[PDB]
């Protein structure tokens, strides 16, 4: 269960921490929120191998971009992801959400499903557990939320996704992207289950 939400001061990424092999939980403290640039991060879903290999390549492309042309846009990062996912669609199983913060463009979110298409959105949800919260998220999302409101929205949303999806679970990791910097958050079962 992964999601990215834009708000007044920027954007927040959120994810669970479960990795499975059938019904066995191979890793219960996985970090699905990964960094491709200082203030451009992604949420990973699907194959762990595919999404890692892709994110590693993108990080390489944006590092080389930065050396030559300066800080890349979030749109530029989404395009590099897309190019990899689209051209290698036959051999990949990767559902990625790209989220970043500019000073000019502020918080932006791009989702990249299986085919390799790109969709810019106010917020995005993905992963097997996202199916159970389409209704909740659509009813409860608002534009220009506060940081505290947005954290609560992600926390409640992923809480339900974890509750119903067997492939989702563990802790709720979150990454906050603003002009202030990069803040990492974590929320444990005892906190979010009782919501």
């Amino acid at each position: 269960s992964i999601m990215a939400v834009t708000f007044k001061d920027g954007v927040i990424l959120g994810a669970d921490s479960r990795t499975t092999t059938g019904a066995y939980i191979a890793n219960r403290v996985t970090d699905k929120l990964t960094r491709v640039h200082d203030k451009i991060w992604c949420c990973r879903s699907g194959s762990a191998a595919d999404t890692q290999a892709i994110a590693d390549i993108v990080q390489y492309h944006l590092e080389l971009y930065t050396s030559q042309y300066g800080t890349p846009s979030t749109e530029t990062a989404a395009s590099v992801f897309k190019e990899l996912c689209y051209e290698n669609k036959d051999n990949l199983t990767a559902g990625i959400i790209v989220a970043g913060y500019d000073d000019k463009n502020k918080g932006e979110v791009y989702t990249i499903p299986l085919g390799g298409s790109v969709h810019k959105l106010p917020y995005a949800i993905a992963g097997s557990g996202s199916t159970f919260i389409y209704g909740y998220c659509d009813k409860n999302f608002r534009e220009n939320m506060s940081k505290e409101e947005t954290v609560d929205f992600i926390k409640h949303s992923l809480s339900q996704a974890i509750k119903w999806d067997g492939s989702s679970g563990g802790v709720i990791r979150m990454v906050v992207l603003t002009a202030a910097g990069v803040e990492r958050l974590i929320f444990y079962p005892d906190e979010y289950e009782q919501l």
Partner: protein
Amino acid sequence: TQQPIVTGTSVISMKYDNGVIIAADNLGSYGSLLRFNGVERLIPVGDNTVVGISGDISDMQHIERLLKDLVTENAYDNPLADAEEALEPSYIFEYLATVMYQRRSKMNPLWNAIIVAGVQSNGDQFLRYVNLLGVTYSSPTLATGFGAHMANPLLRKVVDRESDIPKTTVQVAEEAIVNAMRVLYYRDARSSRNFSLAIIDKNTGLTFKKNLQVENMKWDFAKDIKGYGTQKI
């Protein structure tokens, strides 16, 4: 060889006396899930052509880029790029049709069904279809997917043959298109209420209408329907 993931449904179109109309809903489906609700599937090329695309959206976005790049390339070393040597609907179509047939011949198709609607330099109406197989055909009315089964019958009641085109006005043609889009919303399980419509007239040019909705729907008769046969209550 692949399978389509995020898909777009019907694209419908028809000729009228002074031009062509084309329409398509704003939905990007992910199987039975109506996932993306703000997708533009009509892509204008210049002020004389509109390409309506159905099928795989990732391949649609690829084609969208090819056309954008086509415009850029045609402008190179071309002082008459906004005049005599501007891109025509016939040029844009044949380009796409070439690509589609080449890709199917490599067994790696662009999983789409395309309709190029526009008006030529001499004012002639252009309307032609091409799909993932490279198959091409033209007709006074053209539609993809479910539109082929439900819209064409309705649009062919207005323009049944070539001689009916000069007799058909833009108000009558737009009325028919909008009605057809309602019918598809009644009966296509992968359609949306929201859609976009484009008119390319040889006099008034390109009119691109966004954020249209299906209206004047009939549902009231549902209240009287009870059970599946014998149920009185």
